[PDB]
Structures are given as structure tokens and as C-alpha cells.
Amino acid sequence: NLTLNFGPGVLRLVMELSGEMVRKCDPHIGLLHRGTEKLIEYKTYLQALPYFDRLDYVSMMCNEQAYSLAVEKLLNIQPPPRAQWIRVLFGEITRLLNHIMAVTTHALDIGAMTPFFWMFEEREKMFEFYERVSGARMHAAYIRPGGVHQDLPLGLLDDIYEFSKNFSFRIDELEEMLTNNRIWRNRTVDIGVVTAEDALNYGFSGVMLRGSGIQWDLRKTQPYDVYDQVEFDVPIGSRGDCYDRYLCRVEEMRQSLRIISQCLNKMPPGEIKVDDAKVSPPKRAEMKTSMESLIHHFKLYTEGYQVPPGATYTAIEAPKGEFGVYLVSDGSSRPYRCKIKAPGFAHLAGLDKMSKGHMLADVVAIIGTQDIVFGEVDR
Amino acid sequence: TYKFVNMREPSMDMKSVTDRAAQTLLWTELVRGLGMTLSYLFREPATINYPFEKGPLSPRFRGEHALRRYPSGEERCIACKLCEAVCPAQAITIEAEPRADGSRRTTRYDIDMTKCIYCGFCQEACPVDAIVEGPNFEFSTETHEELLYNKEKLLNNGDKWEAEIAANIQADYLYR
Amino acid sequence: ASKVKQDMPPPGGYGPIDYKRNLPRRGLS
Amino acid sequence: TRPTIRPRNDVVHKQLSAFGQYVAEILPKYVQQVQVSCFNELEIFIHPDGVIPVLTFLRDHTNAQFKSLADLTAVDVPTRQNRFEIVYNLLSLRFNSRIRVKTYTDELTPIESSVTVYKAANWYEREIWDMFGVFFANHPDLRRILTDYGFEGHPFRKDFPLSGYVELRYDDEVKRVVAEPVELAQEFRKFDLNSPWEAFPAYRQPPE
Amino acid sequence: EDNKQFFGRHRWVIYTTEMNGRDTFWDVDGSMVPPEWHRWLHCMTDDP
Amino acid sequence: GVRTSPTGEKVTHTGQAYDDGDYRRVRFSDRQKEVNENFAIDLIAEQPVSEVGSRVISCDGGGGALGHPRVYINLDKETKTGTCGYCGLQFRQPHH
Amino acid sequence: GTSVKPIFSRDMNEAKRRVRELYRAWYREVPNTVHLFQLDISVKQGRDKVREMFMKNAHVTDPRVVDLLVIKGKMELEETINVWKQRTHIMRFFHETEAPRPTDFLSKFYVGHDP
Amino acid sequence: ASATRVIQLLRNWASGRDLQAKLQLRYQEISKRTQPPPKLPVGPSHKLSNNYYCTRDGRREAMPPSIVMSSQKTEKKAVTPAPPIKRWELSKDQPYL
Amino acid sequence: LKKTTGLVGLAVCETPHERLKILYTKILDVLGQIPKNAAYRKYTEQITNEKLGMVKAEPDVKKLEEQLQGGQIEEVILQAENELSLARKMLRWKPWEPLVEEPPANQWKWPI
Amino acid sequence: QLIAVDEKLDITTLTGVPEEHIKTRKVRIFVPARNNMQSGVNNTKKWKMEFDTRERWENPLMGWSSTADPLSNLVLTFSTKEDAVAFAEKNGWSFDVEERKVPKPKSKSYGANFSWNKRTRVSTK
Ligand code: SF4
């Protein structure tokens, strides 16, 4: 019964093995602990928004949306309808990005490595969408606690439609490479099986629940924005292993395509941030012509808006699971406390029980099926 | 509404079992994957010929910072310190005093590019379009010191890139 | 004079977007 | 209440108030306060001795079944005699509801570990111990989880400075990474942003 | 330009063999493009 | 309108130049000192004074929403000219 | 008065016993630490450093503080034994790169404004 | 795509589908990189009258949380935090995969 | 009878009515030892008697699942066992007694 | 179950603060004075704890402002003076406390602006 230290995204793993079997597996984290939560207390709410881009850096606008929803709830305001539709559209695009990354990185770690390139071409196209709407490819800072920063450019919807109508064939090529392959099935079937009750007690969420047959999805049970106005299906697993979770992720990619089609067809007209200049900055022309607009611009960009005192826990169905924020306001323009809840934290904490009685080569598969990014785990 | 991803039970009819046995013994799905890779070999690759070909960008793109001026050549910055106040990374350092003609101007305007997160909050906080994020992104450096920009460097960047900067601002200002 | 102009879907909407899994059976017993 | 104001839900408010009174009636030994916020969030303020009973109740009672522990964290308030407040966020899937349980402690009073109620608590408690210095009794293995090895202090405390006390560099004389007292070429710029002229009359405190 | 090529390969620049002071027959880099052609070449605009 | 130091360094528009005893000059050896050649004060000094037949004029810097905030300038004093606080442009009433 | 909840020890004697146990464990471990990390110090100065770090807290008269210190020291010992630390972490106890600071009034006068 | 007929047939037969119908490379079907100017409407608070800020002030309508059961100051049926969740339905679009 | 309840680790129970009756009678037996004035005893007795009557007035399993508002009688049995365990632990804890002690004067005052 | 210990609270050894940043610093406990540029009083409500000012020097490159003391930006907020004293005492910091300054009530009378025989009569309004 020897000990192995598989050290240096970046993870240290201390495990005891007897022969080939894994007897114990303790992850050591903190190699990407940046002290985000302490840094946020020294910023205004707008200044704190861009940290959520860097929390889970495969799904940026989803973290943006969660933070914005928390601040909106504390502010007792609501975004305009068009902003909500834009938010849900880009949230589904972000879900597509995250699921591509998760599945192709899983396959590459197993050894496939061709679908990685095949689908990172599509990832580059969606990065183009991000850049055209915000000017940045990944760290976008587009979704604000009053709506969105800017309206869409005049030809963006057409190009999103053109992209989304060919993506199903790319998913089909992915499935042709992976779904029915006997080597992939032997690497994934009956690996990392977790029961429903254990998954509930261990704090799992998202696919890690739905793979075990739990019928739960935050966009269906606790809808935010315009989600209750779109229809889609929730894929549900049956054996609670890596193979069922992979199938669930592919099906969620397809359902994201469905939701994106609906969002494209029902995009409404109007403004894109809340018409309340004490929260959302005025337009540049108004700022340069009106006294109140100039004053409110000055104060919003120097002091920031004050948030009434109180505490909220706001959670969303991020592509990796339930992503939450416990936000405490003391009445000023800077948050008093911001605790970030990342699903990968609980998933990595459950890695030890998920890898009991398995081979060393199965720990990589379990890590890939947990969909871990250490930016959100360490914060 | 929910769907089952893996809830199908295989047929027990002799034909289904023989088809599964043929799949096991003759490796039909492996041949199918090989055919997929073969078909992908014969389609045109997505590679562009950098640096002779470039990646498409938008007028909203955030690149290297620049300081602008009016058509008269007088600088737009009037040292309000709004960009310094809003900078999430505290990357802007500003010092100001009355000029020899009584004008409100800066004597120090520094941006530490190794602290900057390129969020563009400074250009949207500016009331006179003085500080902007330009279109240039190919400004890698061999030392850490050359990435600490002072006012002369930013004014030189503005004078270098003003044509493209003005065209981009003209293209995008009706959304701002 | 000028009326509102912003990025909108075309009149009549967009064409149907395929999303269902399509893995055909080539065919040989 | 025109389109810029968040709409409010009275039915959920009434339901959460009723469940709060129900919980308080069932467990009067530990419950000190029950609150429902204007955005329909129910929190229960309890005595520290009731961490294990109350949580167990909320997990196992047929009328609660809060089977999911969404988050466990701490908040540091230096002005209170009991410095730290411990916040449990619980999710019930059977009734599609959320609840929050608060308790308090100081630098020297242990808090019972809730790993026997929720397995998810383990790492969370470690994180609390790492960032605030709150000790949890009967924890299976309590140790640092986020900070560097041998790191001194608890950085999420309010009196802990933002940049800490030491910084790291590589030294060629001893051929290794060494830690030295922190020196910044540019000091962090402290801003005084709070304005006079209070913003919210509804939260005004008595002038005492 | 060649509009029959796919997007990203439909526009390109052949660099000069001698810029301000150095020989650029072999040593070329993307920063040699002036800003106006830089705007055209990155497809920020449709007009050269 | 750039000048030169008695040592040889160029003087910036802010008037900066290392003195003769300063060691920091060593940073420019085998290298250059970045100086912007276009001095804004001299460039704004060359603009002609605009003539308006009104007591109050408005300035936004030109270009509408692409300029600066719109400000109003009083031209009652004949001793001097009205100067915009953002742009530096000058206005006067037609004396004589 | 002032009744407080214990951590581990009801009074000072139990805390002292736990302190002695922790000190015994560190003293036993020091030679293994010196050999296994390939340190350039002797066992004697390693044990001297252990003694100095114990004596730094010798003024504490509160059992809760004492056994919290013991819990932290046990955490440090567990980090050292399992080789979770590197050589740099072990060597940080000695500050071999930090320049010496004079405690004299004149020297502190000469160097700067810091008392 | 400028691929010969024989190469198109070979790649189609190897892939098992028609590839020219859904190409992963983009062509003239994308939108132009120069667009007409937008107009960008205004929001509902842009009225010249009947538009006092006190009637549309979200932040000032927030209040401190309602206190039930402060410990410092009938049949009685049992209650739950919310009504039990209703069972999901089985996707009368594609129930099984 | 059905197979594969759909949750991993939750086995199908044959004859769940007898199991439910036994569990509910055990829960009532444990609740009998709690003081009558305790709110937990009366509330849980109300809930348990309601469910016991519901299972005693319905032989069908799907209709019972619809009427019990729990669904998947197996997880209803799981919840009944959880309630029994809680009842024993709560008899041990005796939380019907008055509050242990009040918090300090401004322990819950927010802001500051 | 209760130790019933009788001693002053001291958590100095547990906070990880370096030795010379405990017994060398001097904290100030005070209600901040109102900014004379404005009339609002909302910033004169709470008690502040702040450390003594240390040396700031000029960075030889770029001329920035450099410091070497980690507590230069540390300001703590307290409801009462007693809370701040308790925190400083348990943290081992020597402190100076200043009593709160309160504007004394003033007698204001608009009618005195127009006085028959007093000097309070104004020459303009
Ligand atoms: S882009 Fe953002 S981080 Fe960079 S200088 Fe501007 S405001 Fe600061």
C-alpha cells in the first residue's frame, strides 16, 4: 500500500494505492487561491463585477448573470425585457461553450483528442460572438446589475442564426466518434457511480444530480429572467456513472440549441438597461447635454450606487451546476461580504468517495466527469 | 418535461443478438469512426495564414490604450480622475495642476499595463472621450519596464492610431 | 422623422433549426 | 410600481412566515428569532448549542426535508462581542424551497461540526477554519485548505490587511523561494467613497 | 482580396521587403500594417 | 514646441528633465527618452478667436455627441475673451 | 464568574500535558525532517528552533488559547511529517535571507523614522 | 467550398451524410462588416410629465425584513415551507434517446 | 409491478403497504413517549395519522402515490424511516424545553 | 462543563500578526469629523479605529508612492467606543481614544433679522 503525490488546470493529489486499486485519494487545493472574496470588499459593485468573469472562466456570462441577479434583488429593481432575453440567449451560448470544453477535455484526457479541435473551431466562432457584443473574447463584463452594457450590433442575430443551424451536425460528428465506441464505453460505463441520496447529502448539483435520476433543474423549478417563457427538456440519467453524465451533457447541448432558436425568434424591442439613472448610467448624449445626467454619470462612476442593507443568497443553473452568491450589503456602495458558492467545490470534495475501489486510470475519468475548473474552486 | 438519455433495452431476438455479435467480432463501429476521421481528412482546414491573414475583429474591440485630442490638437483630457476612480485594478495614476495658460491638464497620467484587466471601464467613464482602448493587440515586449506607460507613451499611441480609433468610434458611438 | 432601428429578427422569424440527434444506420445484417 | 420596480410575491411571503412560526414552535429551545425578507427569504436565528438538532430536524422532518446543503460560510463583524456569524443555506427539493440558519461564535468558542448531518459541510468547515479561525469540534480532519503551507493568520478577518504581511521571491544565494516582509512599489490607494446625506430613510437608526 | 475564399482567408497582406530601416524580406510581423489598412485587414470595416 | 535641456535631454510638455547630478539619466543610455512632439498648449494657442454677435455662446467641442459636455460662455467682458473650460477655444464679441 | 465552554482542557494542567505531548512529538520528528528534506542545518539547531518557537508563547495563561496553539502546532507537525511542505516552507522558520535589524536606539535613529 | 465532385462523394460516403449542405467554414452568407447606423429607442421613464421619481424609485421601496417570533418579547394544522412540487411530465417530443 | 424506480440506489419495494403501516405505527409509538404539550409530538402525530389513514383507505399503489403527494412510494418509505430516526433523536434531545439563553444585546443588529 | 476562568482576554498569539506590528503601533479610536466642504452629517455616526501613519517614499522608477507597513489602509468600524476599546485591548494594540464632538444646540430666530434696537439687524437679505 504505497503513496503517490501527483502534483503539478493545476491540482495536487495525494493517494494511497494497494496494487492497482485506489484506497484513498485526497485532493490538495489552493494553488489558484487569489483571495477574490477579500478583494471584492474593497470595490464598488460595478468594480466587483469583473471578478465573476474570472471565477469560472469557461462560463463567464453565467457568473455575470448570477451576480447581477443578486445585486438586482438587493436593489429592488428589474431589468427590461429585452435585456432579459439577451441574457438568456447568451447564457445558452455560454452553456454550449462550457459543454464543448468539458466533453472535449474529458475525451482528450482519455486519449481521443480529435473532437477537441473539431469543436474548438465552433468555440472560436462563439468567441467571435462574445467579441462582437462586448469587445472581448472571454472576460466580457457584459451583463450588469441593471441589464446589459450595450445593445446588439445590427447584424449579430443573423450570424447567430447562421451558426446555430449547423451546430447539430458537429454534435452528431462528436457522437459518431464517442457515443457508441467500445473503448469509450469501457472507459466510462460503471465508473464513478454515485447514488441519489449520497449525491444529495454530499452537496452535488446539476448533472451530478441528474445522472443519478434526480429530476431537478434550477431553470425549471426556480426560473429567473425569461426562462419560464421557453420550452426545453431536461436529460435524466439512469445509472449515475460517467457515461450517463456524458450523454446528459450532449443532450443539454442539443436543448441549448433549441432554447437559442426560441430566443432568436422572440427577441423583443426596447431599451437594454433599467431606466433608472441612479442605478444605470445615462447615455453619452444625455450625459453631454443634461445636468442631471452628468451628475448621475459622475456619481455612478466615482462613488457607485448605494444598495439598501440586507443579505441574499441567489443561485442559478450554471453549466457546471448550482452557482450561488451570498451577498451582504451594509447600505453603502461597497459590498460588506460576498461569499461565492461554486459546484466544483462540493464535486471535488466528493471525489474521494467517487473513486473508491477503482483503478488509477479511472481517477482521470472521474475528474473529467466532475467538470472541475479551479478558478471557481479556489477563488 | 424530461427525457431519458439511456433507458433502452436491447432486443433478444436471434437477429438482434447476431447483429450485436457481428458488431463485436467484426468491429463495425470502429470502422465507422475511422470513416468519420477519413471524411474529415478530405475537407478544407480552417487554418489562416498568420501573420499574412488576420482574425476578424469588431469596432468594439479592446486593445492598447491611447490618449486622444481635439481636431485643434488640444488634448481632450481635463483631469477629472473619473477613469482613475473607476479602474477595478487601480492601474491608473493621475497628477494634475493648472497649465501655464490656466488650463486644467494632467502632469502625470500613468497606466500599468501589467495590472490592467482591459475591461474598458475607463473609456466608458470618460466624459470627453479622452482615454480609449484602441484596436492594436500586437504590442508584446521583452521587458516588464516597457509595459508601464507614462503620459508621453499614451499620447504617442493616440497620435499613432487616431485614424483607426476615430473610424471605430464613428462606427460604434450610436450604441453608447 | 427617423424610426427606431435595432437588431431584430426578420419578419416571419427564422427558419427551423435542427437539434435532434441524427446517427443513421448504414445497413447490413 | 411601473416597469423599473421589482414585483413582489405575497403568497410566498405568507407561506415562509407560516413555516417560520411552525419551526419556532417546534424547537423553542434553540430558536431566538425568525425573519422573512422583502424578497421572500426566510432566516432562522438560533443559539449555537442547537446547530446539530435544528439542522437534523430540517433535514429529516417530513414537513421540511431540506436535504441539500447549498452553502456554509462565515461573516466577520468586529463590533460584536461574538465576532463571527455562521450561515447555513439549505435547499429542499420536495417543497422547492430554501432556508437560512444563522448562529454565532467568537475566537475561542468551538462550534459543533455538522458533517454527520451533511457530508458537504466537511470542506466548507475547513474553509471557515482557514479563513476566519473558527474551530469546529469533532471534525474528521480539520486543517488548512486554501492558504499556503505554514501561512500565519486568517485572511478573511476584517483586521487582516489586504496584502498580508509577507511576500515571496526567488533567492539565488540560498537557491530557493523565500518569504520576506511585504514592500509595495505602489501602495494601494484607499478611497473615501461614502457620501453624507443618507440614502435610505427606512433603515435609519434611532439617534440614541 | 478573394471573396470566394472562406471568411478569415478572403483578405491578406504581402509585406514589403524593406520597412523604415530594417530588411523585412524574411523578418515580418503583424505590427508593420498602418492603422487604416489595419482596420481593413481585421474586417472591422468593409471599405479599404 | 519641444526644447532641450542644458545637458542635452529633451524637455517634455510637463517640463520634466533630469538634472545634471541625477543618476536616473542612466536609464536612457543605449536607449531613448519617449517624448511627444506635439505640445497641446502651443497647438491651442494657434487657433483663431471666433467672432459671435451674441452675449452668450455655447460650445460642445465640435462633433455633437463626440465632443464634450455643452457649456455656455459669457462674453460681456471686453478686456479678455471667453475660453471654453473643456476645449480651449476662444470667443469674443465684435469689438469696434 | 465568566463561565466559558472548553475546547479540550478544563484547567491549566491538562493544557500543559498536551503541550508536553506536542513538544515530545516535534523533538522526535526533527531528525527525520532534517534527513528527509536534505536540509543544511543540524539536528541540534532544528531542536533549538523548535524550543524557541515553543518559548515564544510561554506567557499565555489561558487554557483555551493554549490548546488552540496546540491544535495549530499539531497541524504544522502533520504538514511536516506527510511532506506536504517543501524545503522552502521548512527553511522559512530561519529567515536566512532577511537582513539583521538593530534594536539600538541610535541605529534605528540613523536608518529612518521607524521606532 | 471548392472541392471536386469525386472528393465530395468520397467525403460524403465516409462521413455518412451530405457535407455540402452544412459546412463548418463561413462564406458570403455572413453579415457585412459595415452596417447602417442604429436608432436605439428610449425607455419608459422618458416622459415629459407625470414622471416623478418618487413614483418609480425601487431602492426606496425596500424595507427591513419582517420579524416573526422574536424571543425577547386552536387546531393549529401543520404546514410545509411551500406546496409539494408536482411531478414532471415525460416530454411528448422525444421521451427516449 | 414496476422495476427501476429511477433513482440510483433506491430499490423497488414489494408489498409497500405493510412496510408503510409498520413504519407509521413505530413512529406513533415513539411519539407517544414525548410530552403531550410538545408541538413536535402533536404536529408529527397529525401528519402520521393523516398518512396512515391515506394508506389504509387505498389498495392501489399509483393512486396512493398520487394521493400521498410524495410520489414513488419507495421514497415515501425512505422519508418514513427518516422521520422515525428523527423522532428517536428528538426524544433524546428534548427541544420542547424553553430557550437555553438569550443572545447578547446587539448580536443580530444589522447594519453594524 | 464550564471552566469559569477569570482573566483578561488576549488573542495576540493566535492572529498571526508579526511581533513588531503589535507593541509598536498606536491605534486611534475616534468619531471622524465632518468634512467642512459639505453639510451632511451621515459620515459622523460610527466609531473608527485607524493605525499610525508610517513612512511613504518615492519609487525610483515611475515615481509612485511606496510603503512598507501592511496596516496603512486598515480602518475598522464600531458601533460604540466601548466596542472599539474591547477590540483593541484583546488584540494587544495600545490606543488613544478621543471623545465624540457634538454640535451644541443653537437658538435661531428669523425675526431677529429685523430688530428695532439690537445689533442682529441685517443690512441685506
Ligand atoms: S481597461 Fe479597465 S483595468 Fe485597464 S485601465 Fe481601463 S478601467 Fe483600468
Ligand code: SF4
Ligand atoms: S482620461 Fe477622461 S476620465 Fe480620465 S482623467 Fe482624463 S478626462 Fe477624466
Ligand SMILES: [Zn+2]
Ligand atoms: Zn469647447
